[PDB]
Design a binder for this molecule. Structure first.
Ligand SMILES: [Cl-]
Ligand SMILES: [Cl-]
Ligand SMILES: [Cl-]
Ligand SMILES: [Cl-]
Ligand SMILES: [K+]
Ligand SMILES: [K+]
Ligand code: NI
Ligand code: NI
Lengths: 112, 112
């Protein structure tokens, strides 16, 4: 699937009042990072479209753009999962098993 | 976005009767290949979920599973685009510009 892992967790197992206070800095930092990587992904998609518009064949331009798409997507996957682990570190320990239930099940469905 | 590039093209700019005859072998080969890579992707997602269920931290298991997910996703992206180019080779030349319009626009939206 194509689930939004970060959103799934904040919606299904929301932070409590104190956890939200604790996590606010790291949540903001991640929001900025997600936006930056998404800007790169959109730009890479645009380079791939441009390449195929110019010359609709595998080509150096397609090879480079495909790699750039892949790299941005992987950066986003990894950054998101690192931030999921930040969230878990900021939870009260007793909240971690429910968080993990949602996380595990969502990962198995391909959420990222 | 998360568009299904292959489906978008077959639905919006379907093959004509003779093109469909010409392309049937390669379409079947691609259907089998897509299924194989998707099976690998589902398995990788399951290894990632398993790893986090065991030990919810970045870990060798998470590193390996993340890489395996990435590899399968990239294999699927590339295989799909190679097959899109197979489709284009099997079109009557006069059908290629409409095909390309749909392809370019969909790529710019992140369809894969
Ligand atoms: Cl929340
Ligand atoms: Cl819990
Ligand atoms: Cl078709
Ligand atoms: Cl045309
Ligand atoms: K993930
Ligand atoms: K693509
Ligand atoms: Ni968060
Ligand atoms: Ni096809």
């Amino acid at each position: 699937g194509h689930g939004d892992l970060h959103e799934i967790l904040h919606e299904a197992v929301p932070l409590d009042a104190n956890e939200r206070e604790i996590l606010e800095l790291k949540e903001d930092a991640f929001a900025q990072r997600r936006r930056e990587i998404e800007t790169r992904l959109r730009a890479a998609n645009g380079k791939l479209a441009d390449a195929i518009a110019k010359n609709p064949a595998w080509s150096p331009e397609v090879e480079a753009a495909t790699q750039e798409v892949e790299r941005a997507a992987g950066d986003l996957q990894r950054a998101t999962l690192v931030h999921v682990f930040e969230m878990r570190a900021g939870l009260k320990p007793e909240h971690r098993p429910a968080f993990d239930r949602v996380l595990i099940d969502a990962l198995r469905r391909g959420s990222q």
